[PDB]
Design a protein around this motif. Structure first.
Motif, short mmCIF file in Angstrom:
data_model
loop_
_atom_site.label_atom_id
_atom_site.label_comp_id
_atom_site.label_asym_id
_atom_site.label_seq_id
_atom_site.Cartn_x
_atom_site.Cartn_y
_atom_site.Cartn_z
N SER A 136 -4.54 3.74 -8.95
CA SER A 136 -5.02 3.62 -7.58
C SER A 136 -3.99 2.92 -6.69
N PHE A 154 -8.93 3.46 -1.90
CA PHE A 154 -8.44 2.47 -2.86
C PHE A 154 -9.41 1.30 -2.96
N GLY A 163 -5.27 10.84 -5.05
CA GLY A 163 -6.28 9.81 -5.15
C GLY A 163 -7.42 10.16 -6.09
#
Ligand SMILES: *[C@@H]1O[C@H](CO)[C@@H](O[C@@H]2O[C@H](CO)[C@@H](O)[C@H](O)[C@H]2NC(C)=O)[C@H](O)[C@H]1NC(C)=O
Ligand SMILES: *[C@@H]1O[C@H](CO)[C@@H](O[C@@H]2O[C@H](CO)[C@@H](O)[C@H](O)[C@H]2NC(C)=O)[C@H](O)[C@H]1NC(C)=O
Ligand SMILES: *[C@@H]1O[C@H](CO)[C@@H](O[C@@H]2O[C@H](CO)[C@@H](O)[C@H](O)[C@H]2NC(C)=O)[C@H](O)[C@H]1NC(C)=O
Ligand SMILES: *[C@@H]1O[C@H](CO)[C@@H](O)[C@H](O)[C@H]1NC(C)=O
Ligand SMILES: *[C@@H]1O[C@H](CO)[C@@H](O)[C@H](O)[C@H]1NC(C)=O
Ligand SMILES: *[C@@H]1O[C@H](CO)[C@@H](O)[C@H](O)[C@H]1NC(C)=O
Ligand SMILES: [Cl-]
Ligand SMILES: [Cl-]
Ligand SMILES: [Cl-]
Lengths: 401, 397, 396
Positions: free
Chosen positions: A10, A392, B381
């Motif tokens: 991440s 994140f 991500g």
């Protein structure tokens, strides 16, 4: 350990992906948005035109011939009518009389005055004029001096009058003028000079009103004996300045390539000839006919032909271009010749050699825009660096749980 | 399984988009500096100078040019002025005549209009140019000439400013007094007087009979141009083919190559302007096989000579206008200068101006829309917060 | 447990900005210029600039349309100010003799149809892609110029004409005779007469009617005219993204104008010009002169309020580059003169050749595309909301 690995990843995503951006942002990229539509209330452009003939034969005086004679190739370097003249006997006889300088005392002479007085008169050339159903007149044309000499601009927009606008496609929403180029007034051509021509007709330039004409270079031709149709499309081009682009933002009031060239050309002549051609801006002394011939003409010719260093202009941030499609039909027809001849008191043959009709209008899709836009502004950068952190902070909350 | 999907799902959309290999087309229109001036090819609409046609020429190419019938006689249906008819009747006298080797290329080269005669004056950017500055190129119109062909290895001609001054101006004499009498309709004769012109990149051969534009005698013609550079993507993004008879790939080069192979295959000969080493078609072959064959290709064909898009195309936008030449006031000057009559001047002289406008350069380039690197960033991500949840479900078990 | 009302406070903020952008309803315009195969050849409409053949004007015609054509004054007499050659004047003075003359029903459409130039006479030769075409291949269409003709109108149900290669060979070539010897004498200025000789031409999609008096281009006699074309397809978005109106049978600016003009004349003149659609009574020559012509002129010249049409969602434009050469050459004049039984001078004054074709890059598209579709919206959020679906199962 899998969760720990995910957390580590991440971080490594917010690292690369956010670095991808700043580098991309600092390339200062752009996109060019294109669109082609039918605009309402389109602003009609300015229309400038010149007669290809610069001086009316009948207005050239003895004093005129004396000063501008050699320049116009009507005289040699000793004020005599050239050995190599190729004129019809009647005109030769008129000139031989004019060129008689015995007991002649020269009087102050000026190229601008010469152009203004001897140049073709819009009041004589303009047979009829209509814009969007309304009759226009010589007063609706503004005098503008170019390298062709005394020219005229329709809808110059310097009168402070209300704007002329176009709304529908087709000739009806445009300009139609009938001109008489007056070949019977054309100066005899006995040689090749920058002020004489082998051609008959007019030069025309359609241009935005805040942009001066450069008609000897950028104009288009219209021939006598035809009705010429000019279907137009206005094209607005916008450019970005550094760092995104190369353009420059605004003698003249708005920046344009032409305005830049004229300004540059004027300085060049003044620097190398100590005078300006009579159509140039500024307050430098007007070039004499001798200077025109010996210095000014060669100088300007060099600039518009050979030069690659001196008058190089940078791109304007705002340019208006006019797309043109020309077509033509014959005038007059056999059936209408006698009518026109009788109307303007000419012979049928004269009509066919001198009369022309010009139609300037826009098509349905009259407006096109080509604009350079900043592709990745500071706001877009954040929104990416931001929306990424929102992923994140989630990938770290799941890890927290 | 509530997030085993939303990850996969939104991940799938971007993945699918990449493998769609999308593109964007970047447009821009600017005033370029040091623009490379194009090549200018032109042909006289008349293919053979009447005064250069010999008895032997007439004997071989007579029927092809409609000047003779299938029995070597001057046609019954001739429509010529008496002087020309009398000249031809004497040429067509073949009594005791022994034919001598003939070929169309030699005929074109010898009888075609001479640039040395047609070119009255020539100027490029203030510099005087000459017949030597024109290269001979054979087309279907016959013997043509190209200005700035760029095959001499000479330094490039460049344009920098907008307007006629930074361009080409030529005064031509089309020489109608040399036009071959027209007594019928053939692929080598025409009803028109003037020239055909084609503005093209130097690495692209001309196809002037198909793509040219006309310029008429008795006028000065202004041609304001804009160079347009178009770039295309090959598969999978696009359809183009990247760069033989010719050195760079172009639609024209492709057509010429194809046409040549078609004629050779069906006529066992090539028209004299075609590349290769196949035998030149005889006048008889031209008439009976070659002309019909080529006409079929450029008119009816939909199968044989279909060329694919080049990855690199240069187009030249054109705006034409004109004024009359000569004016009454200049006629006598020109007549005396070139030793012609004032009427001749009006029927034969033309002035051609080829130049660029201020905004002289436009680019239309296809660029890849979704590159792999771009794909990774968007999916980076989630791709890991799923492969972590993949070694995670295999960890529970 | 505070971390849960944070995920919601982050999913909330990623939705907001995204929602706003969807609401500006932005668009992008995709441009592309290619060499299309099997390009559909357009329709080509043309009119002779002369509306009535002099030799077809009858005594009854002159009686009704005389004043309209400026051949007669308001008292049925040949004008004092006539400017005709003696032979034609003598022909007209005879026609204009109305002693013992009983007028018979007249109408402008019949007049146009009967006196207008005949394609069968004008069309000397016609070829499309190597195939010989004929007058039957041209459809009659009435415009403000009167009786006009359309090539490849596509209303016959015949198979499409297609272009595939660049150049004249893959296009249309017609040789016309404009017949100036038939031009009506011009003695004044009217909306039905002209000072010019030649034809007006309009290249247009087949589902779009011509507006040739306004949007046409000219072709002159004594020349071969080359028209190199490029088809340009433009697509626009309707609201909220754009301004266009989605689909006479198909919506076009022209169709809109014609429809509007017709309504305007009917409303203000209680008649329609003979080339207009509908079932309103045809305008008489008197109505043409006193009401209809001024009315239509007002619309196509001054009007800014009445006939303002909105942008179509689908427009087909044809880029054109014209050039020309002279016809005939000295060497071919006698051939043509003998062939069509005319004098060499006649040929030079009346004959014209028209070439309509496409260049290599024959197809250009300019399409407005929705920049931000709903599916794309979720993508920018779906991730943020996915990281809320997990925090949603660790709260229950
Ligand atoms: C498109 O093709 C043209 C040639 O038709 C390329 O232009 C040449 O570019 C090279 C490299 O700069 C030069 O050496 C040549 O002199 C150019 N030819 C010209 C303009 O005469 C152009 O590079 C091609 N574009 C791309 C990137 O595909
Ligand atoms: C100018 O053109 C004329 C023709 O119009 C040339 O003259 C003819 O010249 C040839 C060759 O000398 C003679 O055989 C003819 O008899 C001449 N005809 C006439 C009508 O005189 C003349 O030579 C040309 N002038 C120059 C100097 O080139
Ligand atoms: C734009 O409008 C044109 C018609 O003017 C459409 O072209 C037609 O498309 C349909 C479907 O393929 C065909 O059946 C017709 O034959 C086409 N007409 C022609 C070209 O003659 C075109 O599809 C429209 N574009 C869009 C997507 O709006
Ligand atoms: C471009 O310049 C014109 C004047 O020539 C002006 O009307 C227009 O607002 C300008 N466009 C922009 C936003 O720069
Ligand atoms: C018409 O022109 C002639 C010369 O051709 C002139 O003598 C006459 O005065 C003119 N007529 C009028 C009334 O202007
Ligand atoms: C040719 O035209 C003339 C009139 O100029 C006419 O008398 C003659 O009948 C025509 N010839 C033919 C065979 O049509
Ligand atoms: Cl300059
Ligand atoms: Cl081919
Ligand atoms: Cl309207």
């Amino acid at each position: 350990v899998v969760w720990a690995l995910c957390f580590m990843g991440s971080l490594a995503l917010l690292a690369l992906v956010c670095t991808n951006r700043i580098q991309y942002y600092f390339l200062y990229p752009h996109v060019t948005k294109l669109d082609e539509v039918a605009a309402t209330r389109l602003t009609f452009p300015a229309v400038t035109f010149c007669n290809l003939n610069e001086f009316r034969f009948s207005r050239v005086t003895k004093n005129d011939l004396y000063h501008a004679g050699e320049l116009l190739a009507l005289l040699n370097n000793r004020y005599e009518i050239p050995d190599t003249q190729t004129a019809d006997e009647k005109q030769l006889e008129i000139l031989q009389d004019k060129a008689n300088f015995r007991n002649f005392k020269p009087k102050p002479f000026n190229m601008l005055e010469f152009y203004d007085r001897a140049g073709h008169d819009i009041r004589e050339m303009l047979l009829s004029c209509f814009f969007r159903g309304e009759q226009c007149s010589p007063e609706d044309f503004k005098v503008v001096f170019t390298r062709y000499g005394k020219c005229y601009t329709f809808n110059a927009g310097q009168d402070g009058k209300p704007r002329l606008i176009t709304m529908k496609g087709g000739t009806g929403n445009g300009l139609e003028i009938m001109l008489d180029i007056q070949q019977d007034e054309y100066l005899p051509v006995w040689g090749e000079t920058d002020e004489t021509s082998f051609e008959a007709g007019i030069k025309v330039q359609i241009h935005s009103q805040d942009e001066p004409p450069l008609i000897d270079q950028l104009g288009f031709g219209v021939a006598p004996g035809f009705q010429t149709f000019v279907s137009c499309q206005e094209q607005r081009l916008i450019y970005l300045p550094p760092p995104w682009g190369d353009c420059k933002a605004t003698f003249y009031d708005t920046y344009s390539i032409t305005a830049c060239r004229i300004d540059c050309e004027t300085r060049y002549l003044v620097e190398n000839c100590n005078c300006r051609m009579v159509h140039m801006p500024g307050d430098a002394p007007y070039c004499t006919p001798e200077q025109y011939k010996e210095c000014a003409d060669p100088a300007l010719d060099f600039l518009v032909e050979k030069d690659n260093e001196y008058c190089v202009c940078e791109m304007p941030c705002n340019v208006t271009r006019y797309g043109k499609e020309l077509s033509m039909v014959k005038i007059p027809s056999k059936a209408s010749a006698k009518y026109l001849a009788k109307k303007y008191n000419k012979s049928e043959q004269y009509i066919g050699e001198n009369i022309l009709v010009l139609d300037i209008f826009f098509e349905a899709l009259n407006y096109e825009t080509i604009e350079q836009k900043k592709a990745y502004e500071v706001a877009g950068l954040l929104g990416d660096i931001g929306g990424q952190m929102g992923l994140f902070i989630g990938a770290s909350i799941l890890t927290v749980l």
